[PDB]
Structure formats: structure tokens, C-alpha cells
Ligand binder design. Sequence first.
Ligand SMILES: *[C@@H]1O[C@H](CO)[C@@H](O[C@@H]2O[C@H](CO)[C@@H](O)[C@H](O)[C@H]2NC(C)=O)[C@H](O)[C@H]1NC(C)=O
Ligand SMILES: CN1CCC[C@H]1c1cccnc1
Lengths: 400, 400, 400, 400, 400
Amino acid sequence: GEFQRKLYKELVKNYNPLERPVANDSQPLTVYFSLSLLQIMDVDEKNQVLTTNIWLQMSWTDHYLQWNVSEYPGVKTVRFPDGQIWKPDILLYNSADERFDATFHTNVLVNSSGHCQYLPPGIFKSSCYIDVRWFPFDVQHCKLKFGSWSYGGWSLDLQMQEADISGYIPNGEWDLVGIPGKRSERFYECCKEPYPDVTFTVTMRRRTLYYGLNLLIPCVLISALALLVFLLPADSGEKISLGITVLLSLTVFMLLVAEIMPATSDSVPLIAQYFASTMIIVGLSVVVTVIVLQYHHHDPDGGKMPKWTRVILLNWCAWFLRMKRPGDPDLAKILEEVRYIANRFRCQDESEAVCSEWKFAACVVDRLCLMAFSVFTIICTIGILMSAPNFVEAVSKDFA
Amino acid sequence: GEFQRKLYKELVKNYNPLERPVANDSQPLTVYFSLSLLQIMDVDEKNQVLTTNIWLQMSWTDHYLQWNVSEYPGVKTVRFPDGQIWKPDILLYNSADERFDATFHTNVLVNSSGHCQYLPPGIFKSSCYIDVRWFPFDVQHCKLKFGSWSYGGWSLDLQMQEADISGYIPNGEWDLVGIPGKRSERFYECCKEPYPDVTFTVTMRRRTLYYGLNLLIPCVLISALALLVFLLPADSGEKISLGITVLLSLTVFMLLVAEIMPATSDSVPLIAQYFASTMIIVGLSVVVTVIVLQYHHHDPDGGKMPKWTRVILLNWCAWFLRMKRPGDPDLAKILEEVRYIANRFRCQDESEAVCSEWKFAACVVDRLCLMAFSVFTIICTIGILMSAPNFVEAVSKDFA
Amino acid sequence: GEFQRKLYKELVKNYNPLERPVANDSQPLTVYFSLSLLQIMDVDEKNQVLTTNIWLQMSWTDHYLQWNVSEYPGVKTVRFPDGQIWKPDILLYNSADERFDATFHTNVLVNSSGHCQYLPPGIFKSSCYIDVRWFPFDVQHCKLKFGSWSYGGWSLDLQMQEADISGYIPNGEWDLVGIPGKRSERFYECCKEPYPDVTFTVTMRRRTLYYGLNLLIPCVLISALALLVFLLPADSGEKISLGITVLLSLTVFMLLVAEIMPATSDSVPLIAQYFASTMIIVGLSVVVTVIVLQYHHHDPDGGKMPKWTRVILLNWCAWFLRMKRPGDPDLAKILEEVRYIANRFRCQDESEAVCSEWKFAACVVDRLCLMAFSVFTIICTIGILMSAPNFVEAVSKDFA
Amino acid sequence: GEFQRKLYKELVKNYNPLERPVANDSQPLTVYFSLSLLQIMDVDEKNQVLTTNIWLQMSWTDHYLQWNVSEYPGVKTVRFPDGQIWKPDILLYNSADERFDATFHTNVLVNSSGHCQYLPPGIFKSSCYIDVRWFPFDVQHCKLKFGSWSYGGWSLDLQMQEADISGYIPNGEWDLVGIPGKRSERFYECCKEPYPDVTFTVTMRRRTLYYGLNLLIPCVLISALALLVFLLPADSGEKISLGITVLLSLTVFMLLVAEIMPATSDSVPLIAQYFASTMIIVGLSVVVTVIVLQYHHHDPDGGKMPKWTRVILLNWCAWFLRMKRPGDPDLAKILEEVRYIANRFRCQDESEAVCSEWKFAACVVDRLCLMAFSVFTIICTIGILMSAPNFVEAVSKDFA
Amino acid sequence: GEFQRKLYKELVKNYNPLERPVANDSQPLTVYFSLSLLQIMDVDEKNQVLTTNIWLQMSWTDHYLQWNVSEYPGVKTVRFPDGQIWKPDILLYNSADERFDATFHTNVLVNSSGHCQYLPPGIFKSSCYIDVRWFPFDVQHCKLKFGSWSYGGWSLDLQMQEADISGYIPNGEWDLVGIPGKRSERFYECCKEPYPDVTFTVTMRRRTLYYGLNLLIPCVLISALALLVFLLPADSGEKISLGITVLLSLTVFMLLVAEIMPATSDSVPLIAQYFASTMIIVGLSVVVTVIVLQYHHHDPDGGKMPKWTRVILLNWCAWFLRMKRPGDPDLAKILEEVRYIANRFRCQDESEAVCSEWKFAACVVDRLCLMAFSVFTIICTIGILMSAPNFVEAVSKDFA
Ligand SMILES: *[C@@H]1O[C@H](CO)[C@@H](O[C@@H]2O[C@H](CO)[C@@H](O)[C@H](O)[C@H]2NC(C)=O)[C@H](O)[C@H]1NC(C)=O
Ligand SMILES: CN1CCC[C@H]1c1cccnc1
């Protein structure tokens, strides 16, 4: 329009985009900085970066970009692209993107009284400490630090407005507790100008249904299945294979969780120590199986059962476990000849009776170690799982 | 051409690219927006990102770019590159790309009466919610929200037009259902002026032939082969090995499944329920195998058959499945010896009879659990696969 | 030199890079387009993306860039960079790159009579449909569509020239068959003027030596190894272990090859059919092994075979396979004892004979199943491999 | 303000950004260069690339950018963007990014007496040698070489200032030791003028808690578990299965470690030596198990124990490891028959005695090899682990 | 400085960056081109690309950029940025980067007599044919072609200077043999002007310590381990498991080796044929083990030993292998009943002999096939390893 063209010609006359738009050069410029969270795109534990979709909000006043709306009836708002007017050089301090600035340079909305409005969008990548001590029952506090790179406090003082969460798109994995901000001042030793900056702390809680279904319950079931070696009879000849196969499956499950864990050496993860305890339990079960197999295949005349072992296992353990114990010249030549066979059969019977005791002792040890290992596994799993804080909150929210 | 040179010189006289080209500055400017779907490239379920290839279509009227073809006999249309003509700042809010705007800036073609056309191509990466509750039989809706950034409702009247799919290239994995649009007006915390936008919803259906033939049929076959542990005679020593190797195969199959799905905690996937059911069935089969093996190797003279187990197994169950049960001092001394031998043989005979009874009981239990597990597996698989909606239509389209 | 400087000053004056350089504005401008294929960089079957290194060849005539070499004795040609002279806006329609244009903008060489020559290079990524029906004996055709974006038929008369492959560098995996071109003009829903375009179809054949030696021969050899389970004597309890280990290895093989193929549900690939048939063969071998083991470990005095089973196995099939089937009162008291012992031995001998007859029946079944499975494996492999077209050509051109 | 506007207009009058701001041309321009390390983002061992977040600090004196504060009461400092004033072209020589420069060009702050400050941020990828000889117990030094490109020693006088680490953010995986700098000038084949440069050496130490808990301890546990093969009785058939499964479980660990580490062929890594030692130990254990099994299943009547073997094993070893050592006409015909039966029984008893002697020899060999293998494993593990120069430091810092 | 200010003002007056700075327009401009290699960043056999860090050296003479030093006493050099003076358009013909040009545009140094220097850095990703025929023992020649894109022989005379490697940083995997270069001319049919181009060939040698320690040694060790099945007694029942385990292990070796290699069909790699030979040897060992198990478990009544098998195995191979071959009415009724038992025992003793013969034959076969396979594996491995050229060179330079 005629009035629009005339005003656009008038405004850019003698305008210097390198100048701070203030009436008094000795006074700072009040700039209001805010934020508008849209969605949490990705949280990467290994690289320790956070990716979010954010609309920034910067607002200030311009002394030169003013006009009387009566002389320009139709026009009430003008718009300028990047590079034609002065804008704050607000940057994200802790950035992980290749190019240090990720915002998209849109237009600037200027009212009739000299009020500007800049809302650039972008996909921001920032580096924050992602603790994995209580994984998967985690709560993370990631920070976003914004501030003017070059303008100090005598020139541009930053003010904070509350972050806008309306329009947030919920994430499937993470639950947003909140996002509170804070305006802080820095005092350089040179001078006496406060340096205002705005920091936003995004606090989120992981939803643990997926991990509980895919990593914890299957490992619990595999460890419980590993307990069956103490129920298999020793004559089957399959006791070792079960345990070693369970150990191999545990190694595979270990690599599965290792490929998603950061290499940080700050603390021992809950899942890591839980896997370690389960693996130790399986190994001890394998050792006990080896000992039981040694007891079962004992040589009948390779030694005598120790008195201490007898009084420990055969009677006391049976009492505790309620396991009952199991169980004419030719005439003389013919006589000696059949007596030899009778004595041989008697010796064989005695040897078998001796071996039965060793077999019973092996069975008793098997049952006792089954009981002990089941108790140990239950106690260790319950304690390790319950040690984590907000575990009750996590289970109540996710699984119910 | 001389006419082209003269018209190009005239058209840029006192032309401001920052000015909105309207005759009356109080009236809005009508802009028509539409899409042109060319190809669906990627549907990343893990990252919830959709990649498409579309041509945006924008049309409006420029008041200043008008001329009479009588004075310029040859030229009818003109083309202006980026930076020399006014263009709407329409961009995608759902953008998941590093650079927020992913369009290729091309020329703007203009009428002899001021009608401008703008068809910029580009590959768009948006973020839409992907539902995995019914994978691989899911239907996905993904939204694309287009609208002007710094221009309010009182400046441009964004008018929606029906999307064009006349040049769509069919995808081998996703079947397009449609792409309708809706134009709505929203308020924002920034300002006090409504901001219109145009949203297009892309509806796709996943073809299930590949996922079926590569995921479900092998699982069915392996789970069915796991049932062979009940037909294997206990005299062999490979039942436990069979069970554990099937468990390992299912574990690797589950890992391959888990490495393609998002880590959401909003629902339990159908494939996850199926895999859990199969794992539970195989685990209980292994437990039953352990029980049967312990029954078969039951040492005689170490406990009699309980009456309850006797009546349940050897009397009732064997009836049910129509399986039957299997089936002079020298002479005095010599007589004593042969009597001893005969008595020992008689005791051996009664012991082996008891052993045969125990083995028959083990076989009966094996047959019972074979039948029960077969019924359980069939029912569970059928129910889990038929629970999902549109399963019949998916099967029909992808197979028949 | 002075003459070159003067000519450069003269040519630039009054020139407009926006106008179309034609003497008559009502006549179209003839532009010749051609390709120069240099290398095929990658064929991504997963993303259906083809990467090539080519040089575009564009040539036209400029009316305003003309001079007489007599007035400028030294200079014969001039070079203008991007943005200083008019250039056609020819770009690839079906681009798969984030930047829709991937051409390095070079200088434009100009005649002394107005002929312009443009040779921009670039690394082009194109989205072409890849058919995996006959993988790895398939032949692929990928299209490259070029044409002006904003210039219609009445303004820019595009023409086609045959592609140049004199500088082609052979690829290790893909063998080039040819690259023809076709020029056509279409109508678009935007406008009512035809828009011509030039399409180049790249036809190439996949070399099969690597895929053969790394996918087909190992599978054949391992299937033949799985066929060896029928020669194992039943006493050595390793048949189940052999079969299940082969099945596990082959599931691993199938799941590994599944990663280098698209998830298109358009057809069942040749390799998929091959591995499915091998799966069924090995599973049926395992089932047969279970049946044979069940027959071998039969319970004596548990029900004799049916006469039908006897005549089928030990009579007909044994002859068919040419197998030979194997095979004073004290005096009275001691007489009774010895008679009892002898009768017990006789009963033991009868039971042994029955067990041996069962074992021979099991061996006969084993031999029959070995023969049948060998025949089936050979037939299935040969049929599946020979069903694919171009198999003979691929073999005779790669292996021979 | 009016004063700011006038000063900005005055300062850029007759200014030339291509000119070096020195009052006297024959003298160099002193520039002070320093660093500001924020955090260490990534250390890629396979690609040998270090990624850091740093701020450069360059300060120099400009002769033309001076003004009197009394004439401009408000403004005390001015700021300029890129292109409008002269800046040093200081680059990182050993860059690894696709773009050779990764800094983000910010504004330049100027005194009222002409003192320019430049603090451009960026994320820098630099290629530095990575030593994996003592991995994980290793300390790495990575160089960062900065310096002007086209300015020599007679034009630019680079001066080094100590690096700042007050803003450092500790990294979990790596522990920073220090960052000293060094300034030196070199000669290049291009030119006959020295070119000074500043090199900062970042020295960091790897924290070994994660690797210790995830890599070494499981390997020690599985290696110790492999020693159980010498305690199993030879009657069972699981020794070879145990050994080979342990070998597989170690092979996959070696696979993962080789995946983690680079393919440099300048030294044998400590973890590689450890894995080779474990491989050799397990293989030798399997060979010993095979030998012991061959000794156990010795055919009686098919050979005799050599005198050397007898004296070596059955006496000296049995003392050393303290193992007990286990071990009328009709009348004549009847007499002959019973004599035959008893004679065959005697022969069977002699064969059984020979078998028992062979079994005892096998047990003695098993025990001796268990002792020897335990000693070898412990000695080798301690020797390999203790050779790291900073093993004591790692143990006393991370674990303690 | 005032002098350099006025010199910069004077030099750019009436300067056109579009023309060749030659005093005579008809005389070609001589340009000297060289290269300075610094690092071999990466070699990608799968993608057939080479990544290097390189400085380019271009030198020419500018006619218009001359001045008298006595007129400007303090100025001896001037520096110009991109787009301000004429520069050769030298490009890399066979680049593989997404952007065809991968150099960083630095300043151009001009001396007082018009001599220009240009040293742009960059990381170049070119494509070269990598031959994996003799992997790991490889020697690769990768080409780098540089030339002017749009300048002929009457315009540019591209001379050559030898490459500079004084600043080369040794790589940990590749040994730089050298970098020769050639200056080649191209003659066109149109014109008699040569078309100079400079190509540099990079000759590299792969250091084989890492590959020979991570691929060769474990393969030969596992292959030697696979020979223990013949030393294993057949009563253990684990030969099949050992063989099948080892085979399956070696597949997870061949597949993971093929993971890192290009899919070319130009030749069969040495590592591929070595792996194939090893797998074939293991498979034949498994078949022989099956045959030996068939011979061992031969029932005594299932036929008679073939005469040829007798004379061969029991005599010839036995002597050759030096294996020792092992080795009133009541009276009548009692007489018959004892003679029956005596005859039963006699028949059992007679039937044991043929079983012993079969077992001895199986042992002979085991020993003979162990002897054969031991030489087979050694011959195959040595021949395959020593077939490659410069294997002695690689060994002497890496291991020794
Ligand atoms: C132009 O836009 C700005 C937006 O901030 C207006 O400033 C606000 O105006 C309302 C109405 O009086 C007040 O309630 C707010 O307190 C003002 N905000 C501030 C920071 O002052 C401004 O008034 C508008 N100018 C015109 C002529 O409408
Ligand atoms: C020190 N610089 C960097 C490498 C070469 C040298 C240089 C010399 C002249 C022009 N450009 C660069």
C-alpha cells in the first residue's frame, strides 16, 4: 500500500543496524527472555546430550522504530528480516551442535510504539549430566543456559519470564516434572555491572514399563530357571549344560545392557550390580553342581566316608529336610566252586550298599543347596530392586 | 528481448520486497495453500520421524506486478528469484530437521495481471506419534502443520486446498489411505491475534507380508518344535538340551524384535505379548521335563508310590488316553548257596518291577503334559494373533 | 589484458541476469541437455537410494553475449560465474538428498558468437525402485528425471542428447548394461502449459560371485551336514544336538541376511524361499529323528508291533534297501533252583530278541528317511536356484 | 543514542577491513592468544579424533578505532560483526572436521582506546595420536596447534597466554590432568619467513572403574570357572562341553573388545595379551581333558601300563598329592561246567582290576593338572595386570 | 598504516576479478601446482573411499598487482580474500564428498612483483579402486586428479612440482611407500591446445600385525583344536558336539570377517579362500567322526566284516601304524540245566569278540584319519598364506 511503502521508506532512513536502540546511551536496555518448550525429541545417555524443540521469546523496545498511526491509517505493524535491524546476540552456552547456533532466523515483529518481538524456532542440542546410578528408575535435571555473548550489564540487562508449557507434546519415554527458571547475575572483578543470565532446568522422569518388561522380568525368569539344576537327578547327565547355557544367556543380556550404558566411572549402576549378583549366583550354583556330581560318582572302594561328613549329612540334614534314608571227591570241589560265586555276589552286594550311601548324601546336598540358593536369590533380587529411591512411585505410575 | 528488458526494468521501480502487496492496507491478503505428495520415503518408528517428498503450492495476487500485454507483445509471464519479490513465510511447525526450514527456494512465476505461483520442492522430516500397540498390524496417522510465522490472521487469510496425489509413487511397505486437511485458528501466549494454520493428516497402512513371513511363522515353527521334548523317550539324554536351545533361539529372536521398536511405556505391543507367551510356554515345558526326568530316574527302595499318585496316574489317566500298563552235608551246603542265589535274583526282579512302574508313570505324565501344552500353545497363539483389529483385512490384502 | 578488460566491461553493461536471452520474445529458447556418467557409487537396497557421480551438460545460445574478434584480437572466449548471466533451472525431480540440488556451480564458458556451455558436476542421490524378487540374480533399472522447474514448453524448448559413458569407471559389484534416454512432456495440476523433461534409465546387472560364495555354498554344505544325522547310530545320543545346532546356525544365517534387504511386502525373495525351504527340511529331519529315537528305545513287553508295521518295515523295505535282519530231596530242591535260574535266563533272552527286532525296525526307518530327505533337498535346491531368470547368464559370466 | 550513532558513523569512515591496523608498517602487530576449555566431549579411539568445547581468546590493539570519551559521554565500548573490521586468521592446523574452521563468528568488543577482544566459541574436532598399549590404564596427550595462516613473523607477533580451566566441567570417563602450552616458530617449504604457532597439549587420564567392572572381572570369573573341568568325575560326559562353552564365552568377549579397539599395528595391547593368555590356558585345559579322557577309557587286554608311567604316577604323585589307592559220570561234567563259570568270573575280575588301576591313574593326572593350571592362571593374570605403569594409581583412585 | 592504506586503495582501482591477469591476451598463463600431504585419515574398503588431509600449493603471476617498494616503504606483501582477485578454478576430478569442492578458502599472498601464493587446506574424500585380493597383505595405489575445470591450453599452462611430505604424520595401520606424480596432456579433436593435468598416486602398505594377531592365529588355533576328535575315545560321546561347536564358532568368524569387506566380485580374497578351506576340513572331520561312530556301535549280529576291510584295516594299516591288536534222573536234569547256562555264557563270550574287532577297526580309522588331516590342514594353511606376494616382507617388517 501507499502508506506502507511510505512508512517503510521513512523507517530505514539513517538507520544503523549496528546501534543499540536507546534514547540515553548511559542507560541499559531491558530485554525480556523466555522459553516455550514443544517436545523432548531425544535423550542420549551414551553421548550425554539432550535434543529438544524450543521456541525462544525475546522482547524489547526500540526508540527509533516509532510512528503515528493516524498518518498511516491501514498500517499498524511492520516486519523486518535478519540483518536489517538490531537484535540481541543471545546464545546457548552449553551447546553440542556442530554450528554453535541452531536457531532459525525469522522476522521481527514491531508494533506502532517501538516494541519488538522475536520468536525464533530451532532444534537445540545441549550437553547435560545424565546420571545412570539408579537406572532405569531415573530422574534427570538437564540445564539450558542462555545469555548475551558480548553485551554486558551497563548495556543489556536480561529479564526472565516463566517458561510456557502449553503446547507441550508428551513423550512416550519421559515424563516432564517441570521446567523452572532462574535469573542470576555475575560480577566481574573489573567492574560493577551485573551480568544477567537465564538458566532453565528441565526435570524429567523416565517411564520404566518398557525396561521392566524387556530387561528385568526376563532375567528374573532365567535366573529362576537356573535353579532347576538342583532338582534334576544326577543320572540324567545334563546338570552342567543347563547352568552353562544360562550363563551364556546372561552374558548376552549383559552385552545388551552394556551397549546402551555410558562409559562413566562415577558410580556402579543398579542394573549392573544386579546382573553381577545374578551371574555370581549362577556360577556358585555351577560349582555346587560340580561338587554334587563328584559326590554321586564316588568310587565304592576308593576310601571311607568321613565320620564328620556322615554326622553332618546323613542324619542331621535328613532330620532338618525330612528325607528318610533309602533301604564223593567231586562234591567238595563243586562245594568250593559254588562258594566262590556266593562270596563274589556277597561282595558285589556290599559294594552296592556302600555306593547307595554316597548317592543319598549327594541328593541331600542337592536339596539343601536348592533351598539355600532360592532364599539367597529372592533376598538379593528384592533388596537390590528396593534399594532405589522413588521405586514405589515408578511402579505405581507405570505398572498401574 | 527489448520488451522483456523494458518490462523487467519497469517492474522493479520503487519496489520494496518488505511490503505486503495489497491495494488497501486494512484488508487482508488471501493466500491459497496446498500440498503435492510425491513419495513416502522413511517411517522411523524408533525416532518417531516421518520423511516425505512433497511440493508445497502457494498462490496469491501481487498488486504492483501488473502490465498490459499490448505494450509488451511477446512477454506474458515473468520469474523472480528469492530476495527480489515478496513471499509468504509459511513453514512447518512439526519439523524434526536440523535446519528448521527444509525447502529448496525456486523462482516465483507471475501472471500478466499479478497472480504469483510458488512451488518449492524439498524433503521434509516431521515428528509424528507412532503407535506400536498393534504392530505389525497398525495404522498410523501423521500430521503436518503448516502456517505463517510472523503474520497474523488480520494480514493473510490462509485458505486450504485439497492435497494432490496424482503423482504419488507407491511404497513397498506402506499403503496410503488418504491425506485430508483441516484449517484452524489458534491463539498463542505471545500476542492477542489469532494465527491460522493448515494441517494435513497422512494415513498409512503397513503391509504385513514381510513381517509375517519373517517374524511370526518362524516363531510358530520353533515353538511347535519345542513341543517335541514330550515325544522324546527319557532313556536318551537330550531333552534338556532341546529345551534350552529352543529358549536360546527365542531369546535371540526377542533381541532382534527389541532392536527395532521404540522404548515407549504407553502400551504393551502385540508382538511383545506373543513373545512373552511363547517364552512362558517353553519355560513351563522345561520345568515339566525336569519333573518327568526326576520321576523316571526314581531310585527304588527309597520310597513307595503314594496312593493318590497311583490312582491319578496308573488307574484314571492310563484309562483316559487308552494306554495300557507294560504287561551228605555237602549237598545241604550247595542247596544253601543256590537258595541264596535264587533269593538274590528274586529281589532283583521285584526291584526292576518297581522301576518299570515308575517309568510307566513318567511316560503317562509326559503324554498328559504333551496334550495340555499343545492345546495351550494353539489357544494362546490364535487369541493373541486374532485380538488385533483389521487383522482379517490385513491378512486378506497381504496374502489373498 | 586491455582488450579482455574492455570486452568484459562492454558485455556486462545493460545486461540483466533475469531476462531470457532470446532475440524474439514470442519464440522459445532451445536448450540441449545431456548426461556424462562417471561412476556408480552405491546402490542402497534398504533405502531404495542410488548414488552416482555425473556431469550435467547444458548448452544454449545467448543473444547479448556477442562480439567481433577483430576488435578484440586476443580474447576468443569468456567465463562468467554463478549469478551474473542467465542459466536454466534444470534440476533432478526425484532427488533423495536433504539439499534438493547437489550440483557444484562452476563457470559458464561463452563462445565469441553467443554459445554458452555449462558443465556442473555433483554427487547425485536418487530414489529409484529396487526389485529384490530375484536377489541376487536381479537386474535393476533406475530413473533420473531432469527438467526445468518454472519454464514451460512455450518458453524453454528442452532437447535430449545421448549420454556419454566414455569416462565410465567399472564398479566391482554392479555391471553396467546401458543408459538410454527418453524425452517427454507432461501436464501438471498447477498450470495449463506442458512441461517437457528428459529421463535417463540406468540399467545394471549384479555380479554374483561374492554373494554366491558367501551365501549359497555354505548353506548347501551345512544342509548336507544336517543330512548326516541319519547315519548316526542311535546309541550315540547326539542326533538331536546335531539337528538343533544346525537349526540354530541357520536361523542365525537367515536373520543376518534379513538385515541387507528391504522390508517391502511386494514379493517373496528367492533367498527367502530358499531359507524357508531349508528350514522346513531341517525341522522335518529333527521330527524324523525324534520318531526314530522313540522307536529305538521301545519298552519290551509293552505291545508288539501291528502286523501292518511289521510287513511294511521288516519285510518290504528291508528287501528294497538290501538289508539283512540280524539273526535225595535236596537233589530235587537244587534242581528246582537251577531250573528257575535257567527259566529266568530264557525270559531275558526272549526280551533281548524283541528289543533287537525293534532296533532293526528303527534302523530301517532311518535309512528310508535318509534317502527321502536327500532326494527332497536336492530337488528343492535345484528347482529354487534354476527358477530365477538370467541364472545361466550370471553363472557363465561370473564363475566361468 | 545520537552520540552512539555519530560515533558509529565516524569510526567506519575511510576504514578498510583488508588493512592491518598498525601506525608503523615496518613493525609487527602483537596479538595475544589463549584458550578456555569447557569440557571434553568425546575421545574416539577407532577414528583417533578428539572433540572438545573451547573458547578462543584473541586480543590486539587497533590504531584507527580510537575516540575521546569526553566528546561521546554515553558510549564507552563499540562492537562490530565479521567483515567490517580486521581480524586475525588463526586456524587449527590438525583439524578433522569437514569444514576446516569450526568457530562461530561473534562480535568484536573494542575499547575507547582501541583494544579489540575476540572470544569466538566452537566445537573442535582434532586428530591426535591415541596410545592403546596400556589400555585401559593409559594416559593420553593430544595436541591443539593454532596459528595464523597467511601472516608471517614480520607481520603478526603471536604471543601465548596461559589457558583457563576455571569453567571446566568434569567428565565421567576421563580425568583431566593439565593443559600447558608452548609457542614456537617453524620454517615451511612455501616461504622464507618463520611462522609462529601456539600448541596446547591436553593431558588426561582414563578412569578405569567401568572397564574394571565390565571387562576384566567377568573374564577372571569365567577363566576360574574353566578350571572346574579338572574336578568333574570322568564318569559324566560334560567335561568337553564345559570347556568348549567356556571357550565360546571367551571368544565373544574377545570379539567385543576387538570391536571397541582400533586396528593400529604398532604395539600389542595389554587386554590383547590377557585374552591371548586366557585363550591358550583354556585350549591347553581342553587338550589335557582329552588326554585324561583317553586314559580313563582304556581298553583292558589291549595294552599294559608302561613302567615309567607307573613309577611316575601311581607312586611318586600318589605320595605327593596324598591320594589313597583303591585296590558219578554226571558229577564230573557238572564240575567242569562250574569250573568254567568260575574261571570266566576270575578273568572278568582281573579285567576289572586293570580298569580300576587305569581310572586311578586318570584321576591322579586330573588332580596334578588342576594344580598346575591353577598356578599358571594366577601367575599369568597377576603378571599381565601388574605391568601397567599406573595400575597402582588406577586402583588407589577409582576403586578406592 | 597510511602507505598500505593508499596501496590497497590504488591496487583495487579498475580491477576486474573475472579476467586472466596476463599482459598479453594470446599468451597462456603459467600456473604451478603442487601438493603437501599431512595425514592419511581413513581408508574405507567397503565404500572404496580415501580420506586425507592435504594442503594445495598454487603459484602464478598477476600483472596488475605490482608496485615500487620505494614508493611504499613499509609494505612488501598484500593479502586478498575470496572474490576479490582472480584465482585458478582447480578442482579434484574424482571427489566423493557431497559438496564437490572440499577445500577451505583462505587468503592469497601477493608479493611486490606480482607473484601470487595460494595455500588452501582441506580434508579430501576421493574414490579409488581398493583391491582386497591379497588381504591383509595389501599394497594400494589411490589416485588424485587435479585440473582446471574451464581453462584450456591457451589460458592455463598447469605445470607440476613434486609433492611435499616433510610434515607427514605416520599412520598406525598404513605405511606410506611414496607419492609420485605425473603431468599429462589431453589433446582434443577441435583444437591443438594441450590440456595439462596433474595426477598424484598414493602408494600405501598395510601393516599386518593387528590382522595377523586377531584373525590368523585364532583361526589356526581353533582348526588345530578341531583335530582332537580323533584323539577322543568314542565311549565319551562328545565328538559330534566338539566338531559342531567348532564349526559353528568358525562361522561366527567368517561372517564377522565378511562384515568388514567390500562386496566385490572381481576376485576371491585370500582370507575368504582360507576360511573356506578351514570350514571344509572341519566338515570332512565331522563326516569321518560319523563314520567312526557307525563302525564303533556295530551290533555283533548285523552282518560280517568284509574281507577287504579285514585285510586292509586289521593287518596293513595296523602294522603300518604300529598299533597292537588286543590279544538218578534229577542228576541228568541238573546236568542239562547247568549246561544251558554254560552254553549261554560261551555264546556271550564268543559274541563279544566281533564287537571288539569292530571297536579296534574304529580306532584304526580314527588314528589314520588323524594322521591324514594333520598334514592336510598344515599344507593348506601354509600354501594359502605363502601364495600371497610380499608376505615375507610383511612378516619381516611387522612381526620381527
Ligand atoms: C504495541 O505492542 C506492545 C506489546 O507489549 C504493547 O505494550 C503493552 O500494551 C498493553 C496495553 O496498554 C499494556 O497492558 C502492556 O503493559 C504493554 N506492555 C509493556 C512492556 O509496556 C504496546 O502498548 C503496543 N503499542 C500500541 C500503540 O498498541
Ligand atoms: C603457515 N601457513 C600455513 C601453511 C603454509 C603457510 C602459508 C604460507 C603462505 C600462504 N598461505 C599459507
